[PDB]
Amino acid sequence: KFEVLLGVYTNAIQYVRFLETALAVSCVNTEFKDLSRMTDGKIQFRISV
Amino acid sequence: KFEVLLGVYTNAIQYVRFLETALAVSCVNTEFKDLSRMTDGKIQFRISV
Numbered sequence: 001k002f003e004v005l006l007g008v009y010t011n012a013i014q015y016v017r018f019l020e021t022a023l024a025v026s027c028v029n030t031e032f033k034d035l036s037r038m039t040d041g042k043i044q045f046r047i048s049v
Numbered sequence: 050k051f052e053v054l055l056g057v058y059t060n061a062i063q064y065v066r067f068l069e070t071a072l073a074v075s076c077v078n079t080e081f082k083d084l085s086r087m088t089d090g091k092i093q094f095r096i097s098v
Contacts, residue, residue: 003089010095 018024035043067073081087 006092
C-alpha cells in the first residue's frame with residue numbers, strides 16, 4: 001500500500017523588462033549618467049519661442 | 050386464420066467511452082492499473098512570488 005506523489009511543479013517567473021514594456025515609449029533612456037554625477041539636480045535650458 | 054408476427058426487434062446498446070465523449074477535454078486521464086493499492090495521492094506546487 002503506497003502513497004503516490006503525482007508530480008511536483010513550480011512556476012516560471014516571467015522576466016519583465018522596462019525596455020520591453022511600452023511604458024518606455026514615453027521615456028528616452030540617455031546613456032549620459034552625469035546628472036547623477038552632477039552635484040545640483042538642475043539643468044538650465046535657453047529655450048527660445 | 051393465423052396470428053402473424055411482423056418482426057421481433059431490439060435496440061443496439063451503443064457503447065459510450067469516456068475518451069470518446071467531449072467531457073474528456075476538461076481532464077487528462079491515466080490508466081493506473083493498481084489504484085486500490087494507493088492510499089493517498091499528492092501533487093505539490095511551489096510558487097516563488
